[PDB]
Chain length 298, copies 4
């Protein structure tokens, strides 16, 4: 864990922009990468849940990884989410992430079909082998994956050879503290943006999140406030983030984010892929206003 | 609903055989189709959960659909499970099922990402359009999909134009009865093999199931016995099925079934795809005995 | 299990009548006991969930047990639901049930606080001791109790010395069959009325239910139809029961039942205890019509 | 909400001491009240979940409330948990709490039977009426109660006339922040001890907890640390609390706490009421050493 500390920080879970025909919008992808760099984000987590990975083909996910590395390699940290249900498919993506010069790979616990804990562990070992030296970020999201690991199971996973971090998308901040207590050196990313400040206090040392695409500097600000013992600033920031997240939960999170980015002149066409539908047009004034505010604040 | 009556019956959820390198085992696939036909199954449900769809590429799923239709078209009913999380991917598979001459398509409620009910409805409508005349079998499996439709939502879904059946993989037999009561003419497939007789009594008029690959005629026997008022025979058959299902749940159902079929000289290599592991060797004596019994019964 | 054979059958879960001051209405209690006897019910299950046990004192529950025994002892079977969260309170009620001459006691798995399996076993042992020879009906209702016993645990529970039956208020009809298979002689009551026919087919050999108070003869009719191989009659009866159950779920089940009984001239005041509220006025016409229908049927 | 400000703080959820005969141990109750006062606790929450409310009679609960008021009225704040499933029973306890001179009443959302939101509201209204001027602390504990109120429902409940606070025993710290945001003046108690620091950071302004009986000074330490901007001390204190809570979860929390208090010479007999069993003998050395360490610490 210690030798992977350079993975610590605040990393945006990158969205994947699509054009009007629902194909990859490469110009908006590049813009979004540059926008994140200019914001001072520590890194990008590519092809995750937020990137709409599970409605893309392997080739499409590869195309995104390739373009992001072209734009960002060596400028900020890059973590390739390569996870699929299939081990072999995940391995293909891990090999591609290596080819493109990513700093790390990551995989969601494979979902849909129930797998035993040992099966989960072998899946990660295989993907780690294919990544040929890139550290692995285990990605735990029980709300969506349906996988219910015990703490002892988590401890085993995060100590497999080659694992350098955990992306913990869980609101159980008792478990967050227990993981920190067991693994003093582990890179531990808070996954739910709406509890970020409280997650850091429990023991997370950074985060990966969808809303960082539009306001990542706020999360950076929370890290700084807490380190400096400025609790009022940390709380006020989290409150502002949560006002934004309330709205995005109403609009739909990925599409609301894309829409804000549209009004920030990053994303040409703010659609998610079917079966996601469009943002209700009623929200456009508020989302326009939020883009405007964030641009003035930034 | 009345127009798709001929979809009524007992349809095996076809397994997809793999070779030692985890590629499609085409020879075992063809043998398995012929074996199902020879034992009198009413039809095949291809590329479903049991078929390991969600650890196959679109191309791989199409290759399986194409080969099954070559072997079986016009001899038994053929239902293509075309469902993916992506609507567009599902549409590609529906078009392919039409080109290969399937009798119907089916799609699991798309999973992982939460979608609204309207989004679910638009997903089915798009797939129905791409199926170009093949009726749609809505596939509900809340335990794995994470989708929690209300009864009123199910009623709306199953009355969309082009829907001719529901595959109901749910153990809620109150809801089974309520669905039958609302839709007297709907083809209603019981999805949990271990409650088949009870599902029929509640209102299902057939089933789709994984264990039918090895003992489908027992389920047909249950249909006949209930039709004839022979409750004892139906219960006896259901008891024998459930003894087998207890074992398959211990072994892992798909790989257990593949292993029985291996000992029946149908499937050359009884592996599932990673991250599924192999069957524990401690279960082989029972799986071997079951194969021996079923060969002497059929 | 063989020793308790005479507990098999169809037993109404008796409602506890109250008046407008929320006091026990003993005259309506007696009337309801006689109304049930005349339906040809096999027995009564007194002071259960349906009997509003958990909003009564021990004294009130005892007063009700004593009166039911006066009215019905020797005429029909009598099961006293003595269960409380507290073991000692449950024991007091069990001792009282013995004094009043009940045929059996019953206890819900104690709820609210999580208890270990050993703790549940000791609770049943302690109540069985106080029951002083009355067999015990274990009462499993996971939806309300929060208790999630495994099948192995259920098996150990139902084979404790002194246990003569299981009241299984669960819709898992695989488990219903598995229980019957492990325990061929066990009295096994179906607890969800809206799956009664399917529950019998799975292996239940009777039932205990709230709706039996107003139409218990229908459930006896389903038992008889299944035995005689008249599957369509069993189905049609279950369908009629479920039409009624749809309405009672809309109105609130216990209070809807009490309201029907009120319109049948059995129950003076159709109230449940606070925090149950009254029936919505808009449903009274349907409840009155249902009472009239059921009175005509009988 | 502004008029209940004086209820803000760190209140121990008082344990109810029993003897080997499972009778109330009134001498140990007084000792435990005085011990808590000496720790500098802001107040006591009496006859709650931790107080084993739901395995006591009303008379027993009243006897405890009366003794605690004798020991502590005017010295620390006193909140009577009067909640039962029954509204009338809860009202009796509320009237008694008023007679005894408590500062506030509180009631768990009534459990076991599902009630409508309107029913929950009316339950709280009726208890408030019987509390005759004493403010109400709404008590939300979804894990045990089975009640799943929406945020809008919680907002309505905590703004009923007479409600002065919310005891929020939930680990959802997004919702904790949402509640603070909507109700800037509301007294908001964090209910899960093992996330106390993070709960305060999200917007709780105090807490009610079981483990405060043995180390309440630690929780007061966390409040002070956060107030000063001393994040390190707050984290270190929470970590120490969690080391203890890990052990208590292993041993069983209430009985583990009583056992520590026994080794501190406070509680004569460290038993909970049946169906709670005793502490496993294997854990006694750890609990004694813990008591010794806390005695040395304070």
């Amino acid at each position: 864990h210690h030798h992977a500390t350079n993975l610590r920080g605040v990393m945006a879970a990158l969205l994947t922009p699509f054009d009007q025909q629902q194909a990859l919008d490469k110009a908006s992808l590049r813009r979004l990468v540059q926008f994140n760099i200019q914001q001072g984000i520590d890194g990008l987590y590519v092809g995750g849940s937020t990137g709409e990975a599970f409605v893309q083909s392997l080739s499409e996910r590869e195309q995104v990884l390739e373009i992001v590395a072209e734009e960002a390699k060596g400028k900020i940290k890059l973590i390739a989410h390569v996870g699929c249900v299939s081990t072999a498919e995940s391995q293909q993506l891990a090999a591609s992430a290596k080819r493109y010069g990513f700093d790390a790979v990551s995989a969601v616990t494979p979902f849909y079909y129930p797998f035993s804990f040992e099966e989960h562990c072998d899946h990660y070992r295989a993907i780690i082998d294919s990544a040929d030296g890139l550290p692995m970020v285990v990605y735990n999201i029980p709300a969506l994956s349906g996988v219910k690991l015990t703490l002892d199971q988590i401890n085993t996973l995060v100590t497999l050879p080659g694992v350098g971090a955990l992306k913990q998308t869980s609101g159980d901040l008792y478990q967050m503290e227990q993981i920190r207590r067991e693994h003093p050196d582990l890179v531990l990313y808070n996954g739910y943006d709406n509890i970020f400040a409280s997650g850091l206090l429990a023991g997370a040392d950074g985060g990966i999140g969808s809303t960082y695409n539009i306001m990542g500097w706020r999360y950076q600000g929370i890290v700084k406030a807490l380190k400096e013992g400025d609790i009022q600033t940390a709380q006020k920031l989290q409150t502002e983030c949560n006002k934004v997240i309330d709205l995005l939960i109403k609009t739909g999170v990925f599409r609301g984010l894309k829409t804000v980015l549209h009004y920030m002149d990053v994303v040409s066409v703010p659609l998610c892929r079917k079966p996601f539908g469009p943002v209700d047009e009623k929200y456009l004034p508020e989302l326009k206003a939020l883009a405007q505010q964030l641009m003035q604040e930034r």
